[PDB]
Design a protein around this nucleic acid. Sequence first.
RNA 1: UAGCGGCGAGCGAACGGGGAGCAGCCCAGAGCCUGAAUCAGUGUGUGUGUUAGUGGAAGCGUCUGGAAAGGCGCGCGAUACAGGGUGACAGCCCCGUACACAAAAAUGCACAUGCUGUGAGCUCGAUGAGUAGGGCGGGACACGUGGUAUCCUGUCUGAAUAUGGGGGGACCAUCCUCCAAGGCUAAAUACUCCUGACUGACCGAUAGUGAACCAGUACCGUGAGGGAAAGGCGAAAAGAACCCCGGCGAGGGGAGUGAAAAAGAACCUGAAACCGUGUACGUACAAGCAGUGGGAGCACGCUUAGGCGUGUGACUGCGUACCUUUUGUAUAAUGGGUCAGCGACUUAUAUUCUGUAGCAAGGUUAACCGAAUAGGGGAGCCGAAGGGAAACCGAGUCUUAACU
Lengths: 64, 144, 201, 117
Amino acid sequence: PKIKTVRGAAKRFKKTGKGGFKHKHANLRHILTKKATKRKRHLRPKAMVSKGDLGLVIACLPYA
Amino acid sequence: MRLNTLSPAEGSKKAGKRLGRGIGSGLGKTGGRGHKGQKSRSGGGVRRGFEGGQMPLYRRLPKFGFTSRKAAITAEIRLSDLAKVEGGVVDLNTLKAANIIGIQIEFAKVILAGEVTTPVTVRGLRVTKGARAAIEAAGGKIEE
Amino acid sequence: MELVLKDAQSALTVSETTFGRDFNEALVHQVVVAYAAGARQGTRAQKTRAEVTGSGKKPWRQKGTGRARSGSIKSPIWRSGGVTFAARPQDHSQKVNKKMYRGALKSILSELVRQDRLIVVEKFSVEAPKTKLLAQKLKDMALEDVLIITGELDENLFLAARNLHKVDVRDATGIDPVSLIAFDKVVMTADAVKQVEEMLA
Amino acid sequence: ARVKRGVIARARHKKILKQAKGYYGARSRVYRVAFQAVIKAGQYAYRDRRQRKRQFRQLWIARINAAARQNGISYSKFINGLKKASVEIDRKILADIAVFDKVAFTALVEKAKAALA
RNA sequence: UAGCGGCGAGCGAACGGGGAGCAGCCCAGAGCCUGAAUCAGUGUGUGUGUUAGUGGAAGCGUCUGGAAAGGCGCGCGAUACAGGGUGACAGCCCCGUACACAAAAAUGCACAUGCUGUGAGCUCGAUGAGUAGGGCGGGACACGUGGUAUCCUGUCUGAAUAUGGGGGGACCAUCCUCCAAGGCUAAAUACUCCUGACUGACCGAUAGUGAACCAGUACCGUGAGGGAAAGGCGAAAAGAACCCCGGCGAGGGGAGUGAAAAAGAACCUGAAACCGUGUACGUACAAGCAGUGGGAGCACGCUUAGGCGUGUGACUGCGUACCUUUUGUAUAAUGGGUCAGCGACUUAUAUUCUGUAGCAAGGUUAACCGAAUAGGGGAGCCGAAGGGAAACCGAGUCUUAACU
Ligand SMILES: [Mg+2]
Ligand SMILES: [Mg+2]
Ligand SMILES: [Mg+2]
Ligand SMILES: [Mg+2]
Ligand SMILES: [Mg+2]
Ligand SMILES: [Mg+2]
Ligand SMILES: [Mg+2]
Ligand SMILES: [Mg+2]
Ligand SMILES: [Mg+2]
Ligand SMILES: [Mg+2]
Ligand SMILES: [Mg+2]
Ligand SMILES: [Mg+2]
Ligand SMILES: [Mg+2]
Ligand SMILES: [Mg+2]
Ligand SMILES: [Mg+2]
Ligand SMILES: [Mg+2]
Ligand SMILES: [Mg+2]
């Protein structure tokens, strides 16, 4: 039997064709941001071949 | 000619011999050539039971949310593997024995995968830029 | 191809035994072994029970008297109960695919080459219930008690074949890897069920 | 299924237990010897053997000294003469000859003494 | 998994799919026809189990041995050679095993029925209110009041009544589907106090039941309660007549038995810790983890020398056991009186790598069925397509007005 912390993926979750999860950024966005436009410029998720370790505790099937 | 020297020498089952190397790992224990503590011998993983500075916070950090799509799965038609296998009753509906979609779905698509044949007239909705032409060696139809 | 110089009837046939193949042990090993512990819907083994006449808790206090940190009449370390681990019944029983079981079986014509690939007829004068002289027809190979077995895609009456580990009947879709290479003399000649595939007799 | 570890029992123990140069007490009575006595020897023999080739080395060259310095001039100057002499020069243990065949040795002393520039 | 969740532990459905499996009925009523299929109790009978049972195959000589069951040689039986037994390991001795036979009586269950109950079946009926919703407080659904459907009700109220009414997850409309507030129901399904028959890569008396033993005993607690140790002579007792020492004892010596008493009853094998008796070397000016390297000498067996094996070890070079824990240990830190025997990284499901093996753009089955490891079964699972949150696009695709 194996429950996979549904919140682990209930936030930042997907496996690119290579496998590497595209994590995500955030920091200021939507919490309180006013200052610094470019800073805010956010982008679109990446990884940490340093944390993808744990960031893998989950996984299971090709879901969405 | 049997040798009365007290023996034979035939053939049967005396072994298959092999399957996988490394079929053992000091396991069952580790009581052996030394003071093998186990727990690899620090002092704070005794009965393991520990996974701390846990695997959640500061790395499972903030969120970029997600509606978690509705539209069933609706897997893509299949790897352009029509004809000589979709029954042959060209178009496509489900019970197929070399590229099937599973009946619980609804919509289809096609994608531009591998080969076709030529006989294959696909209504049954949706064409990919390519599959339109890929199945130009055929009858593109499409009822949607 | 052929089936080697013959006694009893005619000689042999040109069929296919799925080629006849070579042998890769990797298979037989994993396959015959997989078979041992196969009549195993479960099986005994409870000599365990870390929880015995475990009646009552703690004997000596914790502190005092010295004699070390005592606790629980059932203690594994102690004398009468508690087997630290051990286990339940449990399955053991494996699971072989099909491609493997059905995988490269027989080779008796290939290695026990000179030993077996015989084919005559099922033994019919064989009168209903009797073995008083099944030694009769067992001169039809004269190849003696030599483990030996059979198949005739027809449970018949043949069963007057009881003898410690002498000869056997085992018929129907019931080949059996072990019992194959567990004998040395296994003329099958279930006649027709020797079909390239469905030679399950 | 079973183990009755009791058969590899003394088979494991007698094994060493057979270390009774007396030793003494359980030092060959029980398992105090365990290894704490045999594992002992079992190391003493390593070095304090390995040691001998320097324990019989210094030995000879005490005698070797007493000899040549009893004919005049000692194990220091002595060897010097000897070494300055290619095919003409061998080395101790046999430079023990000074105890079974003096004159032989006493002759070597010569050849050494004279080689001396 | 979709959801729920200090969206934090952890909680997890259903739709739908494969199968085990299969059945629907009465009341809320009058009239008709009239005891009718319907269950259920009871007597009976067969079926079939259960409780006693019956009969059941073939061998001898010959060798060692106390004993043959084995060795050599020849001979039978064989749905029986499964197992147990007998003076050691037996298809042939002894109970069996296959195999075929059974039960005056009793009851299991099935069928057929007698009794009594019950009512079948058509005609005009008739469709379950202090009940559905609801305000309030809890409680049930994976679902924590949340935009929360839906199920209960403490409480306070309270409808339509079938050209009416509930559900389709807040809510409205729409269409789809279904009739609540009254009851009955086989089966697949859960279970071990027992009974019978079969089985074990499950134990072998610190194992296994606490208990192979007159064991929940003796034992300790006012109690509730708690909780042991303790198997073996031999093949048959043939359990040791009689004599001797002794105290009309212990105990023991002869003698008898017997293959053996070195088998003597505290009894099979009989290890260890521990204590005696015999003999040899060492030992009464000698310093310490007691061993190591020398190594004399004696005691001993040796080689028609050749400087040997063995116990010994005067004397002399080094030289402060281990464990564990620590920057670090002779350590004046723990841990060990010594032996003997138990005594701790297993197990199951699930993932992810490695080796390996089998098929390959494929690989594989689950529950289940089974002339039970076979085949049957592809529900389904994984991979060949990625991207965007998602609509959706697709070898693309995001991002942006953007084509960069
Ligand atoms: Mg240790
Ligand atoms: Mg430790
Ligand atoms: Mg499918
Ligand atoms: Mg308590
Ligand atoms: Mg026990
Ligand atoms: Mg199969
Ligand atoms: Mg040196
Ligand atoms: Mg809960
Ligand atoms: Mg009888
Ligand atoms: Mg409809
Ligand atoms: Mg016991
Ligand atoms: Mg015993
Ligand atoms: Mg005895
Ligand atoms: Mg002295
Ligand atoms: Mg010596
Ligand atoms: Mg350290
Ligand atoms: Mg200490």
